[PDB]
Amino acid sequence: TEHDQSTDIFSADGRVFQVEYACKAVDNGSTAVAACCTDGVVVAVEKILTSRMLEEGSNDRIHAVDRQAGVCICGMLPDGRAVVSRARAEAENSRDVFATPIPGSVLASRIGEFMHVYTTHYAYRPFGCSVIIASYADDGPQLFVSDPSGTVAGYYGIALGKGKTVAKTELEKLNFKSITCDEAVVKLTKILHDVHDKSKDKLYELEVAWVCNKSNCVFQHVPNDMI
Amino acid sequence: DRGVNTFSPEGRIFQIEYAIEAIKLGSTSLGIQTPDAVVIAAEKRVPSVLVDPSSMNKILEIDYHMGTVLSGMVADARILVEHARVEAQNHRFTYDEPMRVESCALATCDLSVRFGLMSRPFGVSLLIAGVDENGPQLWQTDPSGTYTRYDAQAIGAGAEAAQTVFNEIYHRNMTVEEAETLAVRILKQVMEEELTKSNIEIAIVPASTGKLEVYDQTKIQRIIDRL
Amino acid sequence: MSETTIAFRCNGFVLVAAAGLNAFYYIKIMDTEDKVTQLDSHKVVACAGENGPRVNFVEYIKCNMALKRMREHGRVIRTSAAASFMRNALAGALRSRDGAYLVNCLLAGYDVAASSDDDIATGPHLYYMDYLGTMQEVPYGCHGYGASFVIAMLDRLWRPDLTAQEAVDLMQKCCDEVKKRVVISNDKFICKAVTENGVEIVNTVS
Amino acid sequence: SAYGLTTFSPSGRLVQIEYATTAASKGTTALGVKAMDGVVIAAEKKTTSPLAASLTVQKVFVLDDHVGCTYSGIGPDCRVLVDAARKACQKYRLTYHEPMPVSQLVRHISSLYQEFTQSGGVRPFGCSLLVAGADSQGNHLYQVDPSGTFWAWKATSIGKGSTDAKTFLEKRYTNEMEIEDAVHTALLTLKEGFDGTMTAENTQVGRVSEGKFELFTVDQLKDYLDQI
Amino acid sequence: SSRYDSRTTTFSPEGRLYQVEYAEEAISQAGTVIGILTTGGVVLGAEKGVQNSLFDSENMEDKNISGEKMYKIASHIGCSVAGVTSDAYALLNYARLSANRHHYTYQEPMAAEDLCRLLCDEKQLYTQYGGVRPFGVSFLLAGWDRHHGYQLYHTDTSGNYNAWRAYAIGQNDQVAQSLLKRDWKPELTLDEGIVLCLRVLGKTMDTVKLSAERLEVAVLHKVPAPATQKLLEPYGVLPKTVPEFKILRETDLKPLIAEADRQREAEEAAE
Amino acid sequence: TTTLGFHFDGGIILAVDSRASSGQYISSQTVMKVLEINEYLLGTMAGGAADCQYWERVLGMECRLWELRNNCRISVAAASKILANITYSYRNYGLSMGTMVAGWDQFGPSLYYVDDKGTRVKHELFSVGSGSIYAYGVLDQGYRKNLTVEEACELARRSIFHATYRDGASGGIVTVYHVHQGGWTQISRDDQTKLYDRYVL
Amino acid sequence: SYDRAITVFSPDGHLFQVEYAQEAVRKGLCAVGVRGKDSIIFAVEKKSVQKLQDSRTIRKIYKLDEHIYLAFAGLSADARVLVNHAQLECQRFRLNYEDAVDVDLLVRYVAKVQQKSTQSSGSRPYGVSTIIGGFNENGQPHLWKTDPSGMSSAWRAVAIGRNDKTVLEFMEKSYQENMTRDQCVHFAIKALLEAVESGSKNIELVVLENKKALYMGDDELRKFVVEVEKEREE
Amino acid sequence: WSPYADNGGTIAAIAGKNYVILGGDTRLNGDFCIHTRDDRTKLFQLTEHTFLASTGMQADRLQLQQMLKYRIQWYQYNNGGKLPSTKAIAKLTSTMLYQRRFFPYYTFNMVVGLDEKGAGVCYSYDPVGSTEPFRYGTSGSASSFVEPLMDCLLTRQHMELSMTETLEMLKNAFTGAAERDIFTGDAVCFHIITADGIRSELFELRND
Amino acid sequence: NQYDTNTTTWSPTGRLFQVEYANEAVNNGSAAVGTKNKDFVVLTALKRSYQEKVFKLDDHVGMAIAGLVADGRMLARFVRTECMNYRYMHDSDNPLPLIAEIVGEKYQRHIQFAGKRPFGVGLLIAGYDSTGPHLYHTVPSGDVFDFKATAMGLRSQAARTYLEKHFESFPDCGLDELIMHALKALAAATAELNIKNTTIAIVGKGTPFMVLTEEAARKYL
């Protein structure tokens, strides 16, 4: 069992255990959900509070990375913040060098590449976060997830963290072709209130954001009255 | 086996804890501050009668108004004192005035902490004694890069004993004679050999003149006899 | 060329002379600087140029020769090897960032057997060098404005079998002709002989 | 990583160099024969399956117009030595405007093997080479091993079937063979150790003659196989 | 990755450097090598391995630069090696480069003890800095210079060197060192030295007759100086004799092997 | 500017004027041109004020470190050598400097000249600056080794005076220092216009 | 570039790499220095007498400059590297300051090189202790010792290497101030023969006087040894 | 294109037994024109007892003011919160100017403040940093007028003032300079520095 | 424990132990408190032979530390330098939200690479900018929390218990009652509080970051 001490070693079965362990940190974190409508994309996440004395906005998990795109972090927040910085730099590079807003599919593939490189070298460890990427540039609305292995995929709806098995069940009873961004906020918030476990985590709040036609394809937090 | 940067489970850095153990196996050194002056003194401890005692000074000049006594590893201490000397002359070069004692303590601690580059911390603590516009002062530096002001302090093997003699006799208001005497008393007790006049060092910095004076053999004996 | 240097070898010695002058534009500061420098027990170099380059060049050669001595059981190095090292330092500097050392030298030595295994031909040697790194063994040679006058005299009067007394006389005539014909004042000379017994000052020449 | 992976052991052995030499001695069989007017080298190229294209598999390489090589052991390791050798030959022509002698090329290769037995962070190469070529001093055949040691030979073999091949060559070798009799002898020696039927598609052959090195095509090799 | 570092340059608990000791054990397993100091030169002799029939010559144009065991470093310095062969080639190139740079800078030959000291400093470096194994080589060096005449040095895996009148490294070096301690004398000639070398190799190999195919012999001696072109170099001075390193062939050894077999048959008679 | 120094039986005298001029406008009449490096060594400035003041302060710092590390005073030969190495390393960078360095060490009194190209010379008498060409006239007439301290101070004072009276770039106050075994003393400061009234008789 | 930490503290304040270096020194051959009125003697044990060794012995006392010599104990190859550094520093000092280097200042440079080897990543300490002696430009003699940690001290007589502690007890009793050049040579030979077996060709010796150095020949040394072997019988 | 521009104008100061008075004009000149008549960048406060005053190129005095402000902030962080004296700042300034020897600030600077005894002092610098302590000083386009006048009225070599009388002399010197130098005019800002604090005042000059 | 030696090793349950242990350095430092009302922030600290615990970072911002002092000083020099550059380029105060972000990001670089050690220190950063008063707490894991009141160090649970009762009343408090609530919270984590073992620091509207002198602190102790 020396094979699980660094990310630069395969096990006999063809696995990389340090990356699996990093994934377990995401699976024990707070729940997130997201949905891709015909207008846009909506993201929502549960924040577990550690004190009743925090200001509002503390330890935000959702961050803008360009005018038209945003990221939500699951698992370890300071690791997520390092990925947010990288993503900001790739979006700026696309505007400065190629004179375009970065397409959603390209942004997700660069984030994946960046995360993968920390699974290859004896001197670094894998990130302990999964990132939800939400974008609306010239390729339409797009929602992607990148995990600690650096694997990247596109979704119509998705859930992450410790409530994900149940939350997935409830996202399967939505109609993705038809739904608008105002309905979505009500349904997504409901799923998150229902999976919350009241024994373990006593204090919590919800954080919600979107990018859609209503907002002029600007990625932003929803106004706190719509919850 | 476990690296140079590792923390223990109660939050201490192991190499720094061990460096502090090496200092408790040193020759004994101490200092006493009065309103008139500051006094420093050290057990010499030569290995044989064939050694010239001149060559084994434990009390060094940094500049006209400041001196040091060292404990622990002598060769490591010479690196630190060379740095303190170079800093005190750079301050005169640039600003045409003597360097304050506290600033010189601070500069020595900024060198002592650059390891992870050097393979290990310095196994040294200094007592620095001087005079500036805030009067006579006594500072201690240690391998953690912390510096602290004291009224009376001892370092090395006889340290624990000498803090019981200080907790009895030391009041903040003594004279030069009472402190000179308290010094040679503590040394007699915690030493191994019999206390001659060529087996210890003493120095003073007085508020009056503000220069450092290292006592000869002649003048030390007057303080043995007064006992 | 404000300072003249002269040298010549005969059967058991080399004589070397150089002018004492140090100047600042048109003012004489002093006229007694010794520019014939001793490199080891049986070697001297006479250099012409400004004080800064002259002194920094001879201290660099002296240091490397002392180092080489102690990593060799303290044995005297041959004159041709010292000449070769100097030439290589002058030529090196010419293609370096700081530029050439503006000095012109004459190197003289007397080679002596190291041990009983040594099959070296013992004798005096004299090498002319210039600031670019040119180096040539010669029977006599000169640098400075006075050089051309003295060379012609030596072409007329020098022989290999001059005695020590005839040679000292011949060096005094050479120095007098520099004083007679060169506008720049070279009023005092210092002279040294290199022989099988080492390096000595010749006091009767000035 | 910058520490050494190859180290001495209590009896003075360097075991990673032995283990690398064991990997070389389990490769498929190659051999070489020096005649009085040239040199031949040959190697087996059996594929694992008939879904593999035979044509593209290379066991014999041109290093320059006068010299070539073959290998046994780990193929991807051999490619690194073949690229370094090609480069050295061209660098020698740029400086002296003549072909690099085979003695100098072998020494260049040998010093690249020696670095991977000592530098930090690397294991040794796991292949032996046979090098064959022509220069001003004549025709040459050399062997180089993972230690970096090299030898000049009249005939030899490397790889799995190498002991039986060397016993067979010791009997049939003479100092007065012509080049064409050497090609015959080389192909006969392979056939002895070969598991299955030797064809012009599953074997490869190269030849030095008249100062040039050339791979046989499949067609040329078929003519020689129909005579043996 | 740091948990798999073997720590090659780390002291162990009696001030020992284990990699340096283990490399010394490798030397003691190699072919025997002998050196002898005479009044006419230095002799170096080596045992070659068993001689297969399929071995070939490199057919080099000049024959006195390298054999199997003997290498020229400069016109006045030669050597012979025991240990890891490819490591020897790396240090041999370093020595060749050092000795010829000295001649570039001073236009005279490098002293023998100086070349030996540079070589040993290159070995010491790998025992103190840089995390890799040391070289596994020992050299006998033969030289001539104007300071001390003929010299014979030996170098070891720690980077230490010493000077010798006769010496042996490799396999049977305690047996060889005992026979030399008996039969060496201050008044040996070059030919008497070569015979004394063949008889010592004869004994350690353990064959009654000396195979001329299983030995190698080199000498460092002084020969008449060649041309003296005073037209092209008007101030060039050569001496009468110059050093030369020579590798003896099978037509120079034939008479000297005879003399070594007769002295072997007259030492088996008295017993 | 005018500075001079010489070595006599009783030590070393140094003397200077005090004007700073571009070449037309006079920026000051009260520059101090003798630098008290420490208490056993003196320097002088001519050429660029800033260059002499900065690098002499550097040299004073190097002397004090030497004293801390070795527990004894640096020699004049070493101090002057430290300054000449610096100027030599900057010989292509356009400094302007003509300094004397004076002191009394275990070999006795020593006087050196050091310039901006790495020059370094040891001798019994120097004058430096644009007024030097007038001061050498008076000084070479009166200099001998057997002067008393009072005579030597007078000779130095009268020489700087005659330079100030003829050279446009020299003037102001004449200052004399004496370097002896116990260190150094400032002997005198006198306005050159008061001196005119004492010497015109 | 290998940059591993080699010399580290362990749990009771020990630096093991430095103590192991000090063990290599105690295994080494014995060396002795003795300061007289106007002379310094250095004497060293040699590996052994052999028929096959070359008569011209390799020197184990080194010259650092005209006026400074060095002897050592420990790993001979590490000592040669330290000697090389100190030779360059002596010449760098002449180039920068013109004067010849003082002995105490050259000893500080060497001690600082040893100390750095105990704190630099990627390298082990030198396994060497040195004895360094010389004269200043005012005829006063100095004698110093350095250890592998970088600690330096001045002595009147001192010993290092194997049986250092025995030779040091002998020297503590018998040493007298202000001895002659010949009385010093006697005292040093005598001290060495507490550790060493015979006194034939297993001693080399250097006598250093203000402006003169001498590697003693075999004949002058034989004379001094028999005189000492006679007095050890009494 | 040159990296240098001269923006014109004049500064002056006079020290007393326990005050110093310092003045700078407010015009900023371009090439053959005027950018503004109300520039305040010539005087710059460093502590409550010490000012920098500069003439020459305006962009270079802006850089030098900021470099000094940051070195003085570091001094307080390394010295227990305490501020450097006027003499300490004067030596720092000398050292900073010489370290740019090879592409120098195009500035003529003064440091003025109170010393430790509480008396006024003025340090004037050439552009690579040579200086000395003095009782008065001036630099800039009108300095060759103002300086001989200050020599005449304050030292009197050819023949103790109140704060009030000293300030009147400077008012009259600037009025004269504004009439005869084409690059000096519009207004003077005066600072009076005492142990208590710093008083300010604006004074009008001719506008042509 | 096979997973507690390096920062680059995840354990099988998804934890990073070396980072949990650096966080114990903070929890064993001496206690410090912070509180804020509509327009001020107050910090108090137990400084007992005087040991420096509070540092000014610019005119508008300062901090208290707990844990390893030499790491404290290294972060103080970094934030100082950042605030000086911001003012050079903009002529205004560096916004407090950007200070808290660069500090968080610098902690995190030291928990992901084998050639760096985690910082073993916790900061309370207090400042005042164009959007009002701010109080942030930072820890060795790289997290940053924005608070109305909190406490860190030894026995800081008692201080936190006291602040949970009163904090909802702090917006309406004046500067004098706010200072008193901060000392009564620090008292709960404790000999009693004098002017020689307690620091008080303040920053706010019309008030640059300052540490009370012993004279000014008498009024409250």
UniProtKB/TrEMBL annotation, chain A:
GO terms for cellular component: cytoplasm; nucleus; proteasome core complex, alpha-subunit complex. The keyword NAD does not apply. Keywords: Cytoplasm, Nucleus, Proteasome. SMART domains: Proteasome_A_N (SM00948). PROSITE patterns: PROTEASOME_ALPHA_2 (PS51475). The keyword Cytoplasm applies. It is found in: Cytoplasm; Nucleus. Residues 3-25 form the Proteasome alpha-type subunits domain. InterPro entries: Ntn_hydrolases_N, Proteasome_alpha, Proteasome_alpha-type, Proteasome_asu_N, Proteasome_sua/b. The proteasome is a multicatalytic proteinase complex which is characterized by its ability to cleave peptides with Arg, Phe, Tyr, Leu, and Glu adjacent to the leaving group at neutral or slightly basic pH. The proteasome has an ATP-dependent proteolytic activity. This is Putative proteasome alpha 7 subunit.
Automatic annotation (TrEMBL), chain D:
Keywords: Cytoplasm, Nucleus, Proteasome. It is found in: Cytoplasm; Nucleus. SMART domains: Proteasome_A_N. Coiled coil: none annotated. Residues 1-23 form the Proteasome alpha-type subunits domain. It comes from the Eukaryota. Gene3D superfamilies: Glutamine Phosphoribosylpyrophosphate, subunit 1, domain 1. GO terms for cellular component: cytoplasm; nucleus; proteasome core complex, alpha-subunit complex. The proteasome is a multicatalytic proteinase complex which is characterized by its ability to cleave peptides with Arg, Phe, Tyr, Leu, and Glu adjacent to the leaving group at neutral or slightly basic pH. This is Proteasome subunit alpha type. It comes from Trypanosoma cruzi.
UniProtKB/TrEMBL annotation, chain G:
This is Proteasome subunit alpha type. Keywords: Cytoplasm, Nucleus, Proteasome. The proteasome is a multicatalytic proteinase complex which is characterized by its ability to cleave peptides with Arg, Phe, Tyr, Leu, and Glu adjacent to the leaving group at neutral or slightly basic pH. Residues 2-24 form the Proteasome alpha-type subunits domain. CDD domains: proteasome_alpha_type_7. SUPFAM superfamilies: N-terminal nucleophile aminohydrolases (Ntn hydrolases) (SSF56235). It is found in: Cytoplasm; Nucleus. InterPro entries: Ntn_hydrolases_N, Proteasome_alpha, Proteasome_alpha-type, Proteasome_asu_N, Proteasome_sua/b. It comes from Trypanosoma cruzi. The lineage of its organism: Eukaryota, Discoba, Euglenozoa, Kinetoplastea, Metakinetoplastina. Belongs to the peptidase T1A family. GO terms for biological process: ubiquitin-dependent protein catabolic process. It comes from the Eukaryota. PROSITE patterns: PROTEASOME_ALPHA_1, PROTEASOME_ALPHA_2. PANTHER family: PROTEASOME SUBUNIT ALPHA/BETA. GO terms for cellular component: cytoplasm; nucleus; proteasome core complex, alpha-subunit complex. The 20S proteasome core is composed of 28 subunits that are arranged in four stacked rings, resulting in a barrel-shaped structure. The two end rings are each formed by seven alpha subunits, and the two central rings are each formed by seven beta subunits.
UniProtKB/TrEMBL annotation, chain H:
It holds the Pfam family Proteasome. It comes from Trypanosoma cruzi. The lineage of its organism: Eukaryota, Discoba, Euglenozoa, Kinetoplastea, Metakinetoplastina. Keywords: Cytoplasm, Nucleus, Proteasome. SUPFAM superfamilies: N-terminal nucleophile aminohydrolases (Ntn hydrolases). Component of the proteasome complex. One of its GO terms (cellular component) is nucleus. The keyword Cytoplasm applies. This is Proteasome subunit beta. It is found in: Cytoplasm; Nucleus. GO terms for biological process: proteolysis involved in protein catabolic process. Component of the proteasome, a multicatalytic proteinase complex which is characterized by its ability to cleave peptides with Arg, Phe, Tyr, Leu, and Glu adjacent to the leaving group at neutral or slightly basic pH. The proteasome has an ATP-dependent proteolytic activity. Its main location: cytoplasm. It comes from the Eukaryota. Belongs to the peptidase T1B family.
